[PDB]
Protein backbone atom coordinates (compact mmCIF):
# COMPACT_ATOMS: atom_id res chain seq x y z
CA UNK A 1 0.00 0.00 0.00
CA UNK A 2 0.95 3.68 0.27
CA UNK A 3 0.57 6.69 2.56
CA UNK A 4 -0.89 9.46 0.39
CA UNK A 5 -3.14 7.06 -1.56
CA UNK A 6 -6.74 9.95 -5.80
CA UNK A 7 -9.12 12.38 -7.49
CA UNK A 8 -12.42 12.98 -5.70
CA UNK A 9 -15.78 14.06 -7.08
CA UNK A 10 -16.64 15.89 -3.83
CA UNK A 11 -14.69 17.06 -0.81
CA UNK A 12 -14.64 14.99 2.37
CA UNK A 13 -16.58 16.37 5.33
CA UNK A 14 -14.88 20.06 15.10
CA UNK A 15 -11.14 20.04 15.79
CA UNK A 16 -11.46 16.87 17.88
CA UNK A 17 -10.41 13.49 16.46
CA UNK A 18 -9.04 14.82 13.17
CA UNK A 19 -5.66 13.11 13.65
CA UNK A 20 -7.06 9.65 12.82
CA UNK A 21 -5.46 9.55 9.36
CA UNK A 22 -3.09 6.96 7.92
CA UNK A 23 -0.81 9.71 6.56
CA UNK A 24 -0.86 11.76 9.76
CA UNK A 25 2.33 13.10 11.31
CA UNK A 26 3.77 10.12 13.18
CA UNK A 27 5.28 12.00 16.14
CA UNK A 28 2.55 12.94 18.60
CA UNK A 29 5.20 14.94 20.48
CA UNK A 30 8.35 15.81 18.53
CA UNK A 31 11.63 17.22 19.80
CA UNK A 32 14.75 18.69 18.31
CA UNK A 33 17.83 16.55 19.08
CA UNK A 34 15.90 13.54 17.77
CA UNK A 35 18.14 11.53 15.43
CA UNK A 36 16.60 10.55 12.08
CA UNK A 37 18.40 8.29 9.60
CA UNK A 38 17.80 7.42 5.95
CA UNK A 39 17.88 3.92 4.50
CA UNK A 40 16.68 2.00 1.47
CA UNK A 41 13.78 -0.43 1.72
CA UNK A 42 12.51 -3.27 -0.43
CA UNK A 43 9.88 -1.85 -2.83
CA UNK A 44 8.19 -5.24 -3.35
CA UNK A 45 8.65 -7.19 -0.08
CA UNK A 46 6.99 -5.15 2.68
CA UNK A 47 5.96 -1.52 3.08
CA UNK A 48 7.80 -0.31 6.21
CA UNK A 49 5.77 2.85 6.92
CA UNK A 50 4.83 3.12 10.61
CA UNK A 51 6.43 -0.25 11.38
CA UNK A 52 9.40 -1.55 13.33
CA UNK A 53 12.33 -2.16 11.00
CA UNK A 54 15.65 -4.00 11.09
CA UNK A 55 18.90 -3.43 9.22
CA UNK A 56 19.65 -5.97 6.48
CA UNK A 57 23.08 -5.36 4.91
CA UNK A 58 22.71 -6.50 1.31
CA UNK A 59 25.43 -6.98 -1.31
CA UNK A 60 24.68 -3.54 -2.81
CA UNK A 61 23.37 -1.41 0.08
CA UNK A 62 22.03 -1.56 3.62
CA UNK A 63 18.25 -1.96 3.50
CA UNK A 64 15.59 -1.78 6.20
CA UNK A 65 12.98 -4.54 6.38
CA UNK A 66 10.06 -5.03 8.75
CA UNK A 67 11.31 -6.94 11.78
CA UNK A 68 10.49 -8.19 15.25
CA UNK A 69 11.39 -6.70 18.62
CA UNK A 70 14.24 -9.19 19.07
CA UNK A 71 16.26 -7.72 16.17
CA UNK A 72 14.72 -4.25 15.88
CA UNK A 73 16.89 -1.33 14.82
CA UNK A 74 14.24 1.37 15.10
CA UNK A 75 10.88 2.67 13.93
CA UNK A 76 10.15 3.78 10.36
CA UNK A 77 8.35 7.10 10.73
CA UNK A 78 8.14 8.29 7.10
CA UNK A 79 8.69 7.07 3.55
CA UNK A 80 9.51 8.89 0.31
CA UNK A 81 8.06 6.62 -2.37
CA UNK A 82 9.62 8.61 -5.23
CA UNK A 83 13.09 7.58 -4.04
CA UNK A 84 11.85 4.52 -2.07
CA UNK A 85 13.64 5.87 1.00
CA UNK A 86 12.65 5.05 4.59
CA UNK A 87 13.28 7.41 7.51
CA UNK A 88 14.11 5.64 10.77
CA UNK A 89 14.14 6.76 14.39
CA UNK A 90 16.69 4.52 16.15
CA UNK A 91 15.51 2.48 19.12
CA UNK A 92 17.99 4.41 21.28
CA UNK A 93 15.64 7.41 21.01
CA UNK A 94 12.24 7.79 22.64
CA UNK A 95 9.08 7.75 20.55
CA UNK A 96 5.47 8.74 21.24
CA UNK A 97 3.19 8.39 18.25
CA UNK A 98 0.89 6.31 16.10
CA UNK A 99 1.96 2.90 14.80
CA UNK A 100 0.36 0.07 12.84
CA UNK A 101 -1.32 -2.67 14.88
CA UNK A 102 -3.17 -5.85 13.92
CA UNK A 103 -5.48 -6.12 16.95
CA UNK A 104 -8.56 -3.88 16.52
CA UNK A 105 -9.42 -4.10 20.26
CA UNK A 106 -6.57 -2.85 22.46
CA UNK A 107 -7.21 -0.76 25.57
CA UNK A 108 -5.16 2.05 27.10
CA UNK A 109 -2.16 1.27 29.29
CA UNK A 110 -1.65 -2.28 27.99
CA UNK A 111 1.82 -3.69 27.40
CA UNK A 112 2.62 -4.23 23.72
CA UNK A 113 5.17 -6.06 21.58
CA UNK A 114 6.29 -5.81 17.96
CA UNK A 115 5.90 -9.00 15.92
CA UNK A 116 7.82 -10.33 12.92
CA UNK A 117 5.86 -8.07 10.55
CA UNK A 118 6.80 -4.94 12.51
CA UNK A 119 3.26 -4.77 13.89
CA UNK A 120 2.05 -3.84 17.38
CA UNK A 121 0.33 -6.73 19.19
CA UNK A 122 -0.52 -7.55 22.78
CA UNK A 123 2.49 -8.60 24.85
CA UNK A 124 0.60 -11.65 26.16
CA UNK A 125 1.14 -13.58 22.94
CA UNK A 126 3.96 -15.55 24.53
CA UNK A 127 7.19 -14.28 22.97
CA UNK A 128 9.40 -12.61 25.60
CA UNK A 129 9.20 -8.86 25.08
CA UNK A 130 12.47 -6.93 24.95
CA UNK A 131 11.18 -3.36 24.46
CA UNK A 132 9.12 -1.04 26.68
CA UNK A 133 5.94 -0.35 24.69
CA UNK A 134 2.72 0.96 26.25
CA UNK A 135 -0.61 1.83 24.66
CA UNK A 136 -1.46 5.50 25.18
CA UNK A 137 -4.88 5.18 23.51
CA UNK A 138 -7.38 2.65 22.24
CA UNK A 139 -6.78 1.17 18.81
CA UNK A 140 -8.80 2.78 16.02
CA UNK A 141 -9.61 1.47 12.55
CA UNK A 142 -9.38 3.58 9.39
CA UNK A 143 -11.61 2.17 6.66
CA UNK A 144 -8.94 -1.13 6.60
CA UNK A 145 -5.90 -0.43 8.78
CA UNK A 146 -5.62 -0.39 12.58
CA UNK A 147 -3.56 2.29 14.33
CA UNK A 148 -2.74 2.99 17.97
CA UNK A 149 -0.85 5.63 19.95
CA UNK A 150 2.17 4.12 21.71
CA UNK A 151 5.13 5.25 23.81
CA UNK A 152 8.41 3.43 23.17
CA UNK A 153 11.34 4.08 25.53
CA UNK A 154 14.37 1.85 25.16
CA UNK A 155 14.92 -1.85 25.78
CA UNK A 156 13.70 -3.92 28.71
CA UNK A 157 16.39 -5.26 31.04
CA UNK A 158 15.02 -8.78 31.53
CA UNK A 159 12.65 -10.25 28.96
CA UNK A 160 9.12 -10.52 30.35
CA UNK A 161 6.34 -13.06 29.76
Amino acid sequence: YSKSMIENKVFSSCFKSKNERVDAYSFACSSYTDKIEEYLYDPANSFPYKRGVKLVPKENSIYVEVGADTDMYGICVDVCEFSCTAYVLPITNNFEGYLVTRNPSIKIGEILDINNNGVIIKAGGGPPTAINIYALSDSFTINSINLIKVAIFGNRGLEKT
Binding site: S4, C14, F15, K16, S17, N19, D23, Y25, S30, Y32, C80, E81, F82, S137
Partner: protein, 309 residues
Protein backbone atom coordinates in the same frame (compact mmCIF):
# COMPACT_ATOMS: atom_id res chain seq x y z
CA UNK B 1 13.45 43.52 11.30
CA UNK B 2 11.45 42.69 8.17
CA UNK B 3 14.67 42.94 6.17
CA UNK B 4 16.08 40.03 8.21
CA UNK B 5 13.14 37.91 9.44
CA UNK B 6 11.23 36.55 6.46
CA UNK B 7 9.04 34.55 8.85
CA UNK B 8 8.09 37.69 10.77
CA UNK B 9 7.37 39.41 7.44
CA UNK B 10 5.10 36.56 6.35
CA UNK B 11 3.31 36.48 9.71
CA UNK B 12 2.67 40.22 9.44
CA UNK B 13 1.42 39.85 5.87
CA UNK B 14 -0.93 36.91 6.55
CA UNK B 15 -2.05 37.69 10.12
CA UNK B 16 -5.20 39.33 8.75
CA UNK B 17 -6.56 36.18 7.08
CA UNK B 18 -7.25 34.40 10.39
CA UNK B 19 -10.94 34.62 11.25
CA UNK B 20 -12.07 36.12 14.55
CA UNK B 21 -12.81 33.74 17.44
CA UNK B 22 -16.45 32.80 17.92
CA UNK B 23 -16.11 33.23 21.69
CA UNK B 24 -16.55 36.99 21.20
CA UNK B 25 -20.26 36.39 20.54
CA UNK B 26 -20.73 35.12 24.11
CA UNK B 27 -19.54 38.34 25.79
CA UNK B 28 -20.44 42.01 25.67
CA UNK B 29 -17.78 44.47 24.45
CA UNK B 30 -17.34 45.87 27.97
CA UNK B 31 -16.94 42.43 29.58
CA UNK B 32 -13.48 41.77 28.07
CA UNK B 33 -10.38 43.55 29.40
CA UNK B 34 -6.88 42.44 28.45
CA UNK B 35 -4.10 42.06 31.02
CA UNK B 36 -0.30 42.04 30.77
CA UNK B 37 0.87 38.60 31.92
CA UNK B 38 2.21 35.51 30.13
CA UNK B 39 2.40 32.93 32.93
CA UNK B 40 1.66 33.27 36.62
CA UNK B 41 -1.11 34.59 38.84
CA UNK B 42 -2.68 38.02 39.25
CA UNK B 43 -4.59 39.31 42.28
CA UNK B 44 -7.59 41.54 41.58
CA UNK B 45 -8.96 43.75 44.38
CA UNK B 46 -12.59 44.87 44.34
CA UNK B 47 -13.64 47.73 46.62
CA UNK B 48 -17.09 48.43 48.04
CA UNK B 49 -18.79 50.91 50.35
CA UNK B 50 -21.66 50.63 52.80
CA UNK B 51 -23.80 52.86 55.01
CA UNK B 52 -23.24 52.46 58.74
CA UNK B 53 -26.43 54.24 59.85
CA UNK B 54 -29.14 56.64 58.74
CA UNK B 55 -27.92 59.99 57.37
CA UNK B 56 -27.48 62.96 59.69
CA UNK B 57 -29.84 65.93 59.44
CA UNK B 58 -27.89 69.19 59.22
CA UNK B 59 -29.63 71.67 61.52
CA UNK B 60 -28.15 74.15 64.03
CA UNK B 61 -24.92 72.77 65.58
CA UNK B 62 -23.87 69.12 65.43
CA UNK B 63 -20.57 67.22 65.37
CA UNK B 64 -21.72 63.57 65.48
CA UNK B 65 -22.28 62.54 61.85
CA UNK B 66 -23.06 59.12 60.42
CA UNK B 67 -20.16 57.35 58.74
CA UNK B 68 -19.70 55.39 55.51
CA UNK B 69 -17.52 52.29 55.65
CA UNK B 70 -15.52 50.40 53.05
CA UNK B 71 -14.71 46.78 52.29
CA UNK B 72 -12.35 44.88 50.00
CA UNK B 73 -12.16 41.45 48.41
CA UNK B 74 -9.17 39.79 46.72
CA UNK B 75 -9.52 37.32 43.85
CA UNK B 76 -6.63 35.33 42.37
CA UNK B 77 -6.64 34.24 38.72
CA UNK B 78 -4.21 31.74 37.19
CA UNK B 79 -2.82 31.94 33.66
CA UNK B 80 -1.11 29.11 31.77
CA UNK B 81 1.29 29.22 28.81
CA UNK B 82 1.05 26.54 26.12
CA UNK B 83 2.99 25.90 22.92
CA UNK B 84 2.68 23.97 19.66
CA UNK B 85 5.21 22.98 17.00
CA UNK B 86 4.62 22.60 13.27
CA UNK B 87 6.79 21.69 10.28
CA UNK B 88 6.97 23.70 7.07
CA UNK B 89 9.06 24.30 3.98
CA UNK B 90 11.99 26.72 3.95
CA UNK B 91 11.93 30.13 2.29
CA UNK B 92 14.93 29.40 0.07
CA UNK B 93 13.30 26.08 -0.89
CA UNK B 94 9.78 27.32 -1.73
CA UNK B 95 10.86 28.19 -5.29
CA UNK B 96 11.56 24.52 -6.08
CA UNK B 97 8.08 23.53 -4.84
CA UNK B 98 6.09 26.38 -6.43
CA UNK B 99 3.84 24.32 -8.70
CA UNK B 100 1.01 25.54 -10.94
CA UNK B 101 -1.60 27.48 -8.94
CA UNK B 102 -0.31 25.96 -5.69
CA UNK B 103 2.85 25.62 -3.60
CA UNK B 104 3.89 22.60 -1.55
CA UNK B 105 4.43 18.84 -1.69
CA UNK B 106 1.11 17.04 -2.04
CA UNK B 107 2.87 13.73 -1.39
CA UNK B 108 4.83 14.91 1.66
CA UNK B 109 2.10 17.19 3.09
CA UNK B 110 4.50 20.13 3.32
CA UNK B 111 3.19 23.69 3.08
CA UNK B 112 4.67 27.18 2.93
CA UNK B 113 5.17 28.91 6.26
CA UNK B 114 2.32 31.39 5.78
CA UNK B 115 -0.32 28.76 5.01
CA UNK B 116 0.95 26.45 7.75
CA UNK B 117 0.84 29.26 10.31
CA UNK B 118 -2.67 30.25 9.23
CA UNK B 119 -3.99 26.70 9.60
CA UNK B 120 -2.25 26.15 12.94
CA UNK B 121 -3.57 29.46 14.27
CA UNK B 122 -7.10 28.51 13.22
CA UNK B 123 -6.85 25.18 15.04
CA UNK B 124 -5.41 26.80 18.17
CA UNK B 125 -8.18 29.40 18.16
CA UNK B 126 -10.73 26.58 17.97
CA UNK B 127 -9.06 24.93 20.97
CA UNK B 128 -9.09 28.22 22.89
CA UNK B 129 -12.80 28.67 22.15
CA UNK B 130 -13.49 25.14 23.39
CA UNK B 131 -11.56 25.82 26.60
CA UNK B 132 -13.37 29.12 27.19
CA UNK B 133 -16.79 27.55 26.69
CA UNK B 134 -16.16 24.33 28.63
CA UNK B 135 -13.13 24.87 30.88
CA UNK B 136 -11.51 21.58 29.85
CA UNK B 137 -8.77 20.84 27.33
CA UNK B 138 -9.05 17.73 25.15
CA UNK B 139 -8.54 16.68 21.54
CA UNK B 140 -10.80 13.60 21.51
CA UNK B 141 -14.50 13.43 20.69
CA UNK B 142 -15.08 11.43 23.89
CA UNK B 143 -13.59 14.26 25.94
CA UNK B 144 -11.03 11.96 27.57
CA UNK B 145 -7.26 12.30 28.02
CA UNK B 146 -7.93 15.75 29.44
CA UNK B 147 -4.94 17.93 30.26
CA UNK B 148 -4.87 18.59 33.99
CA UNK B 149 -5.17 22.32 34.67
CA UNK B 150 -4.27 24.63 37.52
CA UNK B 151 -6.82 25.77 40.12
CA UNK B 152 -8.61 29.09 39.67
CA UNK B 153 -8.83 28.28 35.93
CA UNK B 154 -12.52 27.78 35.20
CA UNK B 155 -14.81 27.96 32.20
CA UNK B 156 -18.45 28.97 31.98
CA UNK B 157 -19.68 25.38 32.29
CA UNK B 158 -17.45 24.25 35.18
CA UNK B 159 -17.35 27.43 37.27
CA UNK B 160 -18.03 26.51 40.92
CA UNK B 161 -20.46 28.20 43.32
CA UNK B 162 -23.07 28.61 40.58
CA UNK B 163 -26.55 27.16 40.09
CA UNK B 164 -26.35 23.56 38.84
CA UNK B 165 -29.44 21.65 37.73
CA UNK B 166 -29.70 18.01 36.68
CA UNK B 167 -32.37 16.41 34.50
CA UNK B 168 -32.75 12.68 35.12
CA UNK B 169 -32.11 10.19 32.33
CA UNK B 170 -35.73 9.04 32.56
CA UNK B 171 -36.87 12.59 31.75
CA UNK B 172 -34.28 13.27 29.03
CA UNK B 173 -37.03 13.70 26.40
CA UNK B 174 -39.60 15.56 28.56
CA UNK B 175 -39.33 19.23 27.65
CA UNK B 176 -41.80 20.02 30.44
CA UNK B 177 -39.43 18.53 33.03
CA UNK B 178 -36.47 20.30 31.42
CA UNK B 179 -38.29 23.63 31.56
CA UNK B 180 -39.33 22.99 35.17
CA UNK B 181 -35.66 22.50 36.06
CA UNK B 182 -34.81 25.66 34.10
CA UNK B 183 -37.42 27.64 36.04
CA UNK B 184 -36.06 26.29 39.33
CA UNK B 185 -32.55 27.37 38.34
CA UNK B 186 -33.77 30.80 37.27
CA UNK B 187 -35.54 31.19 40.61
CA UNK B 188 -32.33 30.24 42.43
CA UNK B 189 -30.45 32.81 40.33
CA UNK B 190 -29.40 35.90 42.30
CA UNK B 191 -28.59 39.07 40.36
CA UNK B 192 -29.43 41.64 43.05
CA UNK B 193 -29.65 45.20 41.76
CA UNK B 194 -27.91 44.35 38.46
CA UNK B 195 -30.90 42.41 37.10
CA UNK B 196 -31.45 45.01 34.34
CA UNK B 197 -29.02 43.51 31.83
CA UNK B 198 -29.17 41.39 28.66
CA UNK B 199 -29.02 37.63 29.08
CA UNK B 200 -27.27 34.93 27.05
CA UNK B 201 -28.32 31.29 26.65
CA UNK B 202 -26.17 28.61 25.02
CA UNK B 203 -27.64 25.23 24.04
CA UNK B 204 -26.56 22.03 22.32
CA UNK B 205 -28.00 21.05 18.91
CA UNK B 206 -30.30 18.43 20.44
CA UNK B 207 -31.78 20.97 22.86
CA UNK B 208 -32.08 23.42 19.97
CA UNK B 209 -34.10 20.82 18.05
CA UNK B 210 -36.31 20.21 21.09
CA UNK B 211 -36.87 23.94 21.68
CA UNK B 212 -38.72 24.63 18.41
CA UNK B 213 -41.40 22.08 19.29
CA UNK B 214 -44.91 23.35 20.09
CA UNK B 215 -45.40 24.29 23.73
CA UNK B 216 -47.31 21.80 25.88
CA UNK B 217 -49.18 27.99 18.54
CA UNK B 218 -46.41 28.89 21.00
CA UNK B 219 -42.90 27.45 21.20
CA UNK B 220 -40.76 26.28 24.09
CA UNK B 221 -38.16 28.81 22.95
CA UNK B 222 -40.75 31.59 23.18
CA UNK B 223 -41.79 30.48 26.67
CA UNK B 224 -38.15 30.37 27.80
CA UNK B 225 -37.49 33.84 26.37
CA UNK B 226 -40.55 35.22 28.16
CA UNK B 227 -39.48 33.59 31.43
CA UNK B 228 -35.98 35.09 31.18
CA UNK B 229 -37.46 38.48 30.27
CA UNK B 230 -39.52 38.21 33.45
CA UNK B 231 -36.34 38.23 35.55
CA UNK B 232 -33.95 40.38 33.51
CA UNK B 233 -36.22 43.47 33.48
CA UNK B 234 -37.34 42.51 29.95
CA UNK B 235 -33.94 43.23 28.40
CA UNK B 236 -32.56 41.43 25.35
CA UNK B 237 -32.27 37.64 25.51
CA UNK B 238 -29.88 35.98 23.05
CA UNK B 239 -29.90 32.30 22.10
CA UNK B 240 -26.84 30.53 20.69
CA UNK B 241 -26.15 26.99 19.50
CA UNK B 242 -22.70 25.43 19.93
CA UNK B 243 -21.49 22.00 18.86
CA UNK B 244 -18.92 22.12 21.69
CA UNK B 245 -21.71 21.38 24.20
CA UNK B 246 -23.55 18.10 24.75
CA UNK B 247 -26.86 18.01 26.66
CA UNK B 248 -25.96 21.24 28.47
CA UNK B 249 -27.76 24.57 28.82
CA UNK B 250 -25.92 27.69 29.97
CA UNK B 251 -27.73 30.85 31.10
CA UNK B 252 -25.84 33.92 32.29
CA UNK B 253 -26.06 37.73 32.10
CA UNK B 254 -23.89 39.92 29.88
CA UNK B 255 -23.19 42.48 32.62
CA UNK B 256 -19.57 43.47 33.22
CA UNK B 257 -20.30 43.93 36.94
CA UNK B 258 -21.08 40.21 37.39
CA UNK B 259 -19.01 38.23 34.86
CA UNK B 260 -15.73 39.59 33.49
CA UNK B 261 -13.19 38.07 31.10
CA UNK B 262 -9.65 39.33 31.76
CA UNK B 263 -7.58 37.36 29.24
CA UNK B 264 -3.88 37.83 28.74
CA UNK B 265 -3.04 40.09 25.81
CA UNK B 266 -1.01 37.12 24.51
CA UNK B 267 -3.90 34.64 24.70
CA UNK B 268 -4.37 34.44 20.94
CA UNK B 269 -1.71 32.55 18.95
CA UNK B 270 1.66 34.29 18.64
CA UNK B 271 4.75 33.11 16.72
CA UNK B 272 7.97 32.35 18.55
CA UNK B 273 11.38 33.72 17.58
CA UNK B 274 12.96 30.25 17.58
CA UNK B 275 12.95 28.40 14.25
CA UNK B 276 14.57 24.98 13.90
CA UNK B 277 16.81 24.68 10.84
CA UNK B 278 19.08 22.03 9.34
CA UNK B 279 20.67 21.11 6.01
CA UNK B 280 17.36 19.88 4.55
CA UNK B 281 14.40 21.90 3.25
CA UNK B 282 12.18 21.25 6.30
CA UNK B 283 12.01 23.69 9.21
CA UNK B 284 10.04 23.79 12.46
CA UNK B 285 8.22 26.71 14.08
CA UNK B 286 6.49 27.31 17.40
CA UNK B 287 3.22 29.03 18.31
CA UNK B 288 2.46 30.23 21.85
CA UNK B 289 -0.85 30.97 23.54
CA UNK B 290 -2.22 31.68 27.02
CA UNK B 291 -5.24 30.20 28.80
CA UNK B 292 -7.23 31.47 31.78
CA UNK B 293 -8.90 34.63 33.05
CA UNK B 294 -12.64 34.10 33.58
CA UNK B 295 -14.07 35.70 36.73
CA UNK B 296 -17.68 35.52 37.89
CA UNK B 297 -19.69 36.44 40.95
CA UNK B 298 -21.34 33.69 42.98
CA UNK B 299 -24.74 32.32 41.93
CA UNK B 300 -24.90 34.13 38.58
CA UNK B 301 -24.61 31.21 36.12
CA UNK B 302 -27.26 28.52 35.57
CA UNK B 303 -25.88 25.23 34.21
CA UNK B 304 -28.43 22.55 33.32
CA UNK B 305 -27.13 19.06 32.51
CA UNK B 306 -29.47 16.47 30.98
CA UNK B 307 -28.18 13.04 31.98
CA UNK B 308 -28.29 10.44 29.21
CA UNK B 309 -27.76 7.39 31.43
Amino acid sequence: LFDENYYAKAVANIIGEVKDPIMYKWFSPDQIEDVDLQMGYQKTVKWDAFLNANPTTIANEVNTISTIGFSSEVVRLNYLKLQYKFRHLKQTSEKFYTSDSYIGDINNNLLPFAQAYKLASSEIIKLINHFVLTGTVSIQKDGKNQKRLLPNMYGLLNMPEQIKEEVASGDKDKMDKIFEKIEAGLSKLELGDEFSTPMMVIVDPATSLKLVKPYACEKWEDVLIQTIKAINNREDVYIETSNLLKHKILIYPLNSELIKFKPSKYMLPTPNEQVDKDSTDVAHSYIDFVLGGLLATRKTILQVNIKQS
